[PDB]
């Protein structure tokens, strides 16, 4: 409890799965908490199964619309007071080999994917930085950002993206000592709805050639690590990789 | 001599620096070659500066340009036969940290870096596989793949996609037996024309704490790698990256 | 609180410096820690300055000493009962290149750097499986286990060796659900007390182009990454590697 | 043809398998070749079976045998002037988990695996540096070297060891101006004699879950890549990690 005192934290498609959770452990800590996702409906619904107006809400948001992201974070601000965590967890992804990809395709996962990330991690930075905040920004890879999957070739390449760029921001904070730290985070397969949205994925990645431990992760696997890392708990991490896998690397 | 017999070769950005020197070494082992770039001018002389027509040729295309990889195709294999080999060496840098790249920036750097990979690599798998060529698509990184920089936030961005993309790639062609190899070469500094014109660069590029070896490479060292990963001699390499960075990676 | 509830850990090393942070958060967390050490004074002064002996004591040995493996094992489960996590953190370093160091220092380092983690690791496994205690195998490496070091040798084989051997153990235990999960956390420099008998060492450890920081970490950030693998928060994390280097194998 | 003119190498485990490979293609590239192993079996049969006395010969030496060592680089410099070129192939391996490796198992394969590559690495350093030889060692290692296996604990740890030690040695000769290179091969799964000797094992290991191309290398698919990591073409690669295979580390 209270390992995220005082912490303003920011998710983007924290209304389902992985996103959820991490709101959860998040308020759960004492963080104040703004959820994101392009569906207001679910979005009220979700904030409030969490806590209270005063500890989380929600925001209509598409992560890769960078003009909202300016709105979103004067609305938190707003709310809140001065951000000092994002969590950039909003992606999709695309059941496709490269040679199978459209054009159409690339582009509609890397915007969300990637300039989403981009979008967020530059407005991160320069909101957060050099306010005694003890800022912290997620950006939330996946193994797929390691290791290649024949058909998630759109996938991969965003991944790999995210993995790099976000060290690169890393290095610039803490050579300009913005009290920025920026990691990210390897879910392995999680049971949420990208992956209960791709046919027969959590049975093929069940099979201990895919997964060690013979079963996939839950949510709470991601947000616990998400905790760490937003805390001061981890404030001599940055630019690193943190793999929640169950093996799947490691073999 | 003749360590790419019978390969026909496109190599993207082949008009200058690495570029030019991998179209040197091949058509030196034997490669047919077709070169491109924007530039006609430069283009056109330095195919003639390698070899005869029958031999090298170049094709103004634009990386970027989707539309146009079909038409490099065509010309490549009616001048000279069905293509087996692709080098994805065309890119460009911006000088920005993550913080203050521009949208404009980000997308003008990955529509060539990342995009035109991506056009190159999925065109090249239709139109290299199940035609026993011993096809080799090798995707020009960098160390920037591998580890970030405070100053090349989309570099580093999409040098990353473009290292993950390509294992995807190289997986799926593999599982299905294309004949299709897909690897990455990560180059370290490298002394080219454009590097002489920034005064310091080659300098602090040199120094100790950045290349251990206290000085770049050069074309060549680069040209080098590609003929093996271009040659059927790394007929079980696939999927995998090689870095010539003299030692820049090593610590 | 109580994020180790219930918990039977073992610290190698856990007298001084990190191993005294992470016994310190442990039993702050509910856990009941036997630390090892070979020296008897400072090991005894070291537990009692943490807690009273139902929850933190001492157990004189050397990691180096397989024999003495065995008994630390039943002295702590006859104290405290089934062991349910083992942290091999004791470990030396060698100020020498590859190239100057004796047979001798080579043989030594590798005795309790590799041999030492190996001997706890396989005892580790014997005697945590199969009993429901969500048992937790933290191997301590370092960033020396990522990149290389002109002058730590024979440290940088060790470290390397730990990372790998540490995946094969995690493999095995999650592939035979043994609920043993084994991971590698990989220090940067850390503010030890070795580092500050070293006159300028943490000088040249600061330099940014060292550590990105621009300042070298404390003990309790290395406790904190092993109090998070310790407890079931990271129940799907195995086979796993874990930074906190201040950004220096970001670079 | 003459990628390794004037180049003297010497190859550990040089009489069979891989070993045998590589030495084919040295002296066939122009370079002397002395080839050593544990065994004397068959060492006069496999020189002569490659050339003729003047470009190849068998010295009887374990690799895990440090007094060896020095023997052997005076046989061969005698034989064919100073070495400029050390292959460090010689290992064995164990199949067993870590849980259930012996001491004495533990201790015989890091004897030969890791103090052997060690010490030969030590003495080459000391006897091709400064002579402008454009000396290169190459240090053997594996895709177990990247990721574990449950039934190599062993293995796994000394091809981790000889992966960082590698980048160690490599800064310190580039540092110092060594004019040595050091770098590590991985190969993946290799069609040889022990293997034909485990009935299924080229089955297993030819699995998609395990090799993605569906069949295991060749042991002239790790002579190639080493045949350009001893040649200048390769004057700007050191401390990097060189990967053969099939796509296992991919995925
Ligand atoms: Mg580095
Ligand atoms: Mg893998």
């Given at each position: 409890?209270?390992?995220?005192?005082?912490?303003?934290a920011i998710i983007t498609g924290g209304t389902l799965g992985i996103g959820l959770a991490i709101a959860?452990?998040?308020?759960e800590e004492g963080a104040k908490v703004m959820i994101?996702?392009?569906?207001?409906?679910?979005?009220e619904k979700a904030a409030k199964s969490v806590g209270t107006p005063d500890q989380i809400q929600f925001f209509q948001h598409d992560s890769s619309d960078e003009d909202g992201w300016t709105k979103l974070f004067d609305a938190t601000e707003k709310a809140f007071?001065?951000?000092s965590t994002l969590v950039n967890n909003a992606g999709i992804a695309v059941n496709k080999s490269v040679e199978e990809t459209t054009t159409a395709e690339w582009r509609?996962?890397?915007?969300?994917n990637?300039?989403?990330?981009?979008?967020?991690?530059?407005?991160?930075?320069?909101?957060?930085?050099?306010?005694?905040?003890?800022?912290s920004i997620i950006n939330m890879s996946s193994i797929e950002g390691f290791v290649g999957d024949p058909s998630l070739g759109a996938y991969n390449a965003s991944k790999g993206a995210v993995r790099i760029m976000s060290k690169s921001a890393a290095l610039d904070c803490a050579l300009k000592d913005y009290?920025?730290?920026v990691?990210?985070?390897?879910?392995?397969?999680?049971?949420?709805?990208?992956v209960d949205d791709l046919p027969g994925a959590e049975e093929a990645m069940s099979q201990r050639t895919k997964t060690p431990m013979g079963h996939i992760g839950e949510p709470n696997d991601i947000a616990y690590i998400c905790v760490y890392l937003a805390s001061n708990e981890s404030k001599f991490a940055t630019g690193s990789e943190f793999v929640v896998d169950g093996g799947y690397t490691a073999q």
């Open positions: 409890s209270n390992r995220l005192d005082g912490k303003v959860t452990k998040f308020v994101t996702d392009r569906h207001s409906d679910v979005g007071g001065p951000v509609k996962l890397l915007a969300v990637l300039d989403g990330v981009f979008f967020g991690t530059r407005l991160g930075i320069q909101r957060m930085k050099n306010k005694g905040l003890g800022a009290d920025v730290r990691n990210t985070v390897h879910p392995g397969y999680i049971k949420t709805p990208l």
